Amino acid sequence: GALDVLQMKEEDVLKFLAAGTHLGGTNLDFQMEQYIYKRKSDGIYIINLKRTWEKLLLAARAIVAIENPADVSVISSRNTGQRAVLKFAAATGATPIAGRFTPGTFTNQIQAAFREPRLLVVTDPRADHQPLTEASYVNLPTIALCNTDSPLRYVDIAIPCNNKGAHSVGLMWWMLAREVLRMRGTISREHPWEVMPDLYFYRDPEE
RNA sequence: AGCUCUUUCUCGAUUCUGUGGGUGGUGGUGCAUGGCCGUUCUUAGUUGGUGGAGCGAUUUGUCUGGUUAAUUCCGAUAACG
């Protein structure tokens, strides 16, 4: 949005630059091309950082529009997102799934794990492909974190970022939790937040 | 064998006689059947419900690999129980 109260600050841009979020792959799909700045002299694509913040605020404006927070479902089958989705679901009251998704969880009405959500958020479209393709049987809207070579086939909001691993995946979930809590009125739009980004990251060498 | 022939005593409504109808049969059909037994077959095999795939007969589950006397376990996984 145009508003100064929604503008991206210097201190967020430095946190993007320090985590590698702007660095894509060596390949580009034709659906992702509008999110790209340029290709480097070494064959790597640069993701446009202002495009990310608009698509992330549009995603937060979808997540705030659900009146019961337990109706939102959150997923990661790769390890680099598992701590991050568990912390996101603690900060705001969504339902997490981590590890293997069981086929038929959304469509086998009798099943012990059966559930019926209103919104679905996924960490990587190529890896999390079962809950994406299974959402096509039940009228379920979708948000996803997309790299330059991600296949867009059932996602309705794609957020441009490096999703390969490490600090970049944890930072995106932390920043999405910050803005949903801000615009619902639970924390300040000006005072810094008490939760450090480093709480969401995956398994750097411990000692 | 009073079976039958000659003879001349005996019993007492129980039988005899014609028609209808029964009853019995190690008689016929095991290619009309039940029950029982043998064999395919001594091996590891077989099947619903709800979900997914095909216009359909059908299929997945019931598996690439390792392990076991074993569809026995581990694990993998559009299937779950």
Curated annotation (Swiss-Prot):
Stretch list, region Interaction with PPP1R16B: 52-111
PTM description: Acylated. Acylation may be a prerequisite for conversion of the monomeric 37 kDa laminin receptor precursor (37LRP) to the mature dimeric 67 kDa laminin receptor (67LR), and may provide a mechanism for membrane association. Cleaved by stromelysin-3 (ST3) at the cell surface. Cleavage by stromelysin-3 may be a mechanism to alter cell-extracellular matrix interactions.
Keywords, ordered alphabetically: Acetylation, Cell membrane, Cytoplasm, Host cell receptor for virus entry, Host-virus interaction, Isopeptide bond, Membrane, Nucleus, Phosphoprotein, Receptor, Repeat, Ribonucleoprotein, Ribosomal protein, Ubl conjugation
GO cellular component: cytosolic small ribosomal subunit; nucleus; plasma membrane
Miscellaneous: This protein appears to have acquired a second function as a laminin receptor specifically in the vertebrate lineage.
GO biological process, one term: ribosomal small subunit assembly
Site positions (Cleavage): 113-114, 131-132
Modification sites for N6-acetyllysine: 50, 87
Taxonomic source organism: Oryctolagus cuniculus
Coiled coil: none
Location of this fragment in the whole protein: 3 to 209 of 295
Protein name as annotated: Small ribosomal subunit protein uS2
Chief place where the protein resides: membrane
GO molecular function: laminin binding; laminin receptor activity; structural constituent of ribosome; virus receptor activity
